[PDB]
Amino acid sequence: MITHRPRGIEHPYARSLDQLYPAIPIAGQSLTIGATTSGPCSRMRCFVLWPEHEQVFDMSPVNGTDSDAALLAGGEGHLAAAQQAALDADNGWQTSIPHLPDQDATYYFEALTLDGRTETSESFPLTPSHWSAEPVGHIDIDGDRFIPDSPLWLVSSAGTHRVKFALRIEGDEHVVGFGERYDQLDQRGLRLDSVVFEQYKAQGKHHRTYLPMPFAQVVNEAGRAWGFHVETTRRTWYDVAATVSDRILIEVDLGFEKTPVVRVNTWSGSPTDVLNGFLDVAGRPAEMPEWIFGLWASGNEWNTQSLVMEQMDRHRNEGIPVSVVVIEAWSDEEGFTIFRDARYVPNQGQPHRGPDFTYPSDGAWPDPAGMIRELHERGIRVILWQIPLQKTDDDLGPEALAQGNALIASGHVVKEPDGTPYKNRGWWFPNALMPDLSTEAGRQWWTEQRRYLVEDLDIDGFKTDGGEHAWGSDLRYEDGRRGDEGNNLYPVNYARAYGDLLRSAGKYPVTFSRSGFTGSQAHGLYWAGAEDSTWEAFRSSITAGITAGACGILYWGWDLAGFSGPVPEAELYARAFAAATFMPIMQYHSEFHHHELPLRDRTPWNVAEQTGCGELIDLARHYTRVREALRPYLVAQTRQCLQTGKPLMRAMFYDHADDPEIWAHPRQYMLGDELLINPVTAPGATTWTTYLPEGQWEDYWSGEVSEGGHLVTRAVGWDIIPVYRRVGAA
Ligand SMILES: OC[C@H]1O[C@@H]2OC[C@H]3O[C@H](O[C@@H]4[C@@H](O)[C@@H](OC[C@H]5O[C@H](O[C@H]([C@H]2O)[C@@H]1O)[C@H](O)[C@@H](O)[C@@H]5O)O[C@H](CO)[C@H]4O)[C@H](O)[C@@H](O)[C@@H]3O
């Protein structure tokens, strides 16, 4: 059996073994053609039927190490899985056509098996595309930066697939946006794209993101700005004056129509005007309760009531208060709906209520309602982890199988082109069902299964993890969208669904997510995702928060000092904990590690113990005291942010764009209007230099006044992070 799928698995940055590459073939350029077999073959040929010539290509076996198998298993971050996947990718054949003729054709494959059988594939269309300057569609765009004769349309006999066009950029202009970015604040000089993807660690090195947007601000060195938003949830690409030094080249997927209309919203004025313009279209941050601004405690290996409470007691006994505990390993690890070890009756996959459950005294959670009641009594809110997938593994218990069947039977699942349920193509929870959160009925069906957690157990919010799982431009959603538009939108609908649940139960919409797109602004809180415990990851995380803030993602946090691998070195923890104190959401977290030694918790005491630096507990006391003192400031500035549209974690160009020097210090940022923050991001530093912009500035720790428009240098013991306050009028 020969398998060929023209578009492949549709991982956004990788090719499967069985596809055309490029997936939309282009006349004049090379075309690589791949196929796989279900049993070993000695030979495969590709027959390509042009009208004037039939041609036969002898294909050659693909070495899996040279395929994208490693990337399809999640990349370098999942090294063991990636390596074995490369070895396993051993049934692929490949040929390539160096300069593809501009003529339509059909093609098929023929193989000879080792036992001597000939096998033949179905026939496939080949309709090559070319770039045309004819006005095949219309770009609808105002302003004076559009280049009128730049549009080119990628057309084939089957239709129009992509468009590219250019915008003028001037010599002094800087480009900030495209959502959360991990590499640099100023995107000028780079090529990038906007597509929701899970890059598991090293997001900066790979130049990818969980939370893109097809939007950016362009700011000159006189203080003036303009901005553009491509009004699409399809993929877009940007060459931000990398190839042509005074041109932003934009490329837009037109998706799975004859004369398309591409709308580009534009704004100009101050930097704050431009961002407000975008938020009036995209959505605005929501009002949140004050308790989001205390310390959040988290750790994946806190998987019993006793383990969570032990840590909460430890926080009290050390004088390091927490406002929020995130519990990730709470459920049966099958349905993410029921606490581990809970006993109950089967009910055909219907929504449970609290009285359905009995909790054994020797089980993982002997009284989770008592835990939540008691935590609330101590001033601590409780957040439970979630994923927008339903596992279908053959080893699942009766309840998880019933839940999945009920999901399917409801209709509220994302579907393949052929109407059957989408089976997750990713490396995380492979083959799982994916609920359709694209309509109200779909969102309610999924969230109703969880309602009792809010109404009966009284939890305060959800860590709405994942959301990047939909691959396939021709998937089907109940709102009428296909995958080409729906897949990037998915994380927005997902956070929205859980916000709606919380709100309908008398709570605030506290969802905590990693992925998003245009519209995510209006749905909860966000964290920077998964990273190692390195200095490079610290610097990249600061850039993530500032750039996220520059696209309206206001309630941003990160896993301070990294969550993955060995605990951070003591100095990184110290510098990162200090930095996190001056960011919108302050949170520590640690990855699953099979409950093995050494303990991986990012608690101040575990890190102190393993690094031999007892002083880290004292430092955490100190900075958490500072955090508490900062709470009315964060509340008041958050209010002003909702009114003005300025970020809370705020790039310097929002208040001082007329100062060209700000761009040489892209990891300094304002926290609200009054405080200038400069994290210490190198090991061994005993002094640290900060560029103060125009005005008078007061040292947060010493009271020392400094004149602005200058660099200043500050001694930086671990009990100090450079923070300067504006000196206002009398
Ligand atoms: O890149 C995919 C994925 O890799 C890691 O998870 C793989 C792991 O998933 C399942 O077990 C999970 C367990 O890992 C843990 O996940 C919570 C974790 O999710 C994200 O990180 C994961 C990796 O851990 C990543 O997306 C997120 O970034 C991070 O902040 C979170 O801590 O806990 C849940 C709940 O207990 C558990 O289901 C799966 O069972 C396992 O086989 C697989 O190896």
PDB file of N, CA and C in Angstrom, residues 181-184 199 201-208 531 536 540:
ATOM      1  N   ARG A 181       7.174  37.586  21.199  1.00  0.00           N
ATOM      2  CA  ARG A 181       8.396  37.211  20.484  1.00  0.00           C
ATOM      3  C   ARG A 181       9.533  37.078  21.476  1.00  0.00           C
ATOM      4  N   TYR A 182      10.394  36.098  21.225  1.00  0.00           N
ATOM      5  CA  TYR A 182      11.356  35.617  22.201  1.00  0.00           C
ATOM      6  C   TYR A 182      12.807  35.990  21.864  1.00  0.00           C
ATOM      7  N   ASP A 183      13.033  36.563  20.676  1.00  0.00           N
ATOM      8  CA  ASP A 183      14.382  36.809  20.146  1.00  0.00           C
ATOM      9  C   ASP A 183      14.813  38.253  20.313  1.00  0.00           C
ATOM     10  N   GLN A 184      13.982  39.192  19.872  1.00  0.00           N
ATOM     11  CA  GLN A 184      14.275  40.619  20.048  1.00  0.00           C
ATOM     12  C   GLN A 184      13.039  41.522  20.003  1.00  0.00           C
ATOM     13  N   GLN A 199       6.504  25.463  20.205  1.00  0.00           N
ATOM     14  CA  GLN A 199       7.939  25.287  20.218  1.00  0.00           C
ATOM     15  C   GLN A 199       8.323  24.930  21.655  1.00  0.00           C
ATOM     16  N   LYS A 201      10.496  24.739  24.253  1.00  0.00           N
ATOM     17  CA  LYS A 201      11.759  25.340  24.701  1.00  0.00           C
ATOM     18  C   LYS A 201      12.502  26.014  23.568  1.00  0.00           C
ATOM     19  N   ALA A 202      13.480  26.839  23.938  1.00  0.00           N
ATOM     20  CA  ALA A 202      14.285  27.615  22.986  1.00  0.00           C
ATOM     21  C   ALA A 202      13.449  28.341  21.910  1.00  0.00           C
ATOM     22  N   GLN A 203      12.436  29.087  22.332  1.00  0.00           N
ATOM     23  CA  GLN A 203      11.566  29.751  21.357  1.00  0.00           C
ATOM     24  C   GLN A 203      12.342  30.826  20.597  1.00  0.00           C
ATOM     25  N   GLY A 204      13.252  31.511  21.298  1.00  0.00           N
ATOM     26  CA  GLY A 204      14.105  32.566  20.723  1.00  0.00           C
ATOM     27  C   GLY A 204      15.077  32.104  19.649  1.00  0.00           C
ATOM     28  N   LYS A 205      15.830  31.042  19.925  1.00  0.00           N
ATOM     29  CA  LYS A 205      16.765  30.455  18.962  1.00  0.00           C
ATOM     30  C   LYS A 205      16.073  30.003  17.694  1.00  0.00           C
ATOM     31  N   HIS A 206      14.848  29.494  17.832  1.00  0.00           N
ATOM     32  CA  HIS A 206      14.068  29.019  16.697  1.00  0.00           C
ATOM     33  C   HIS A 206      13.156  30.091  16.083  1.00  0.00           C
ATOM     34  N   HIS A 207      13.036  31.243  16.735  1.00  0.00           N
ATOM     35  CA  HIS A 207      12.262  32.358  16.197  1.00  0.00           C
ATOM     36  C   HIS A 207      10.794  31.985  15.970  1.00  0.00           C
ATOM     37  N   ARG A 208      10.207  31.283  16.942  1.00  0.00           N
ATOM     38  CA  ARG A 208       8.814  30.844  16.857  1.00  0.00           C
ATOM     39  C   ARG A 208       8.115  31.284  18.101  1.00  0.00           C
ATOM     40  N   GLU A 531      10.601  26.655  29.226  1.00  0.00           N
ATOM     41  CA  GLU A 531      12.035  26.900  29.002  1.00  0.00           C
ATOM     42  C   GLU A 531      12.938  26.183  29.997  1.00  0.00           C
ATOM     43  N   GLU A 536      20.253  32.729  29.117  1.00  0.00           N
ATOM     44  CA  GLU A 536      19.705  33.014  27.796  1.00  0.00           C
ATOM     45  C   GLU A 536      18.157  32.970  27.818  1.00  0.00           C
ATOM     46  N   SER A 540      15.438  36.068  27.063  1.00  0.00           N
ATOM     47  CA  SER A 540      14.372  35.815  26.099  1.00  0.00           C
ATOM     48  C   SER A 540      12.962  35.990  26.704  1.00  0.00           C
TER      49      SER A 540
END
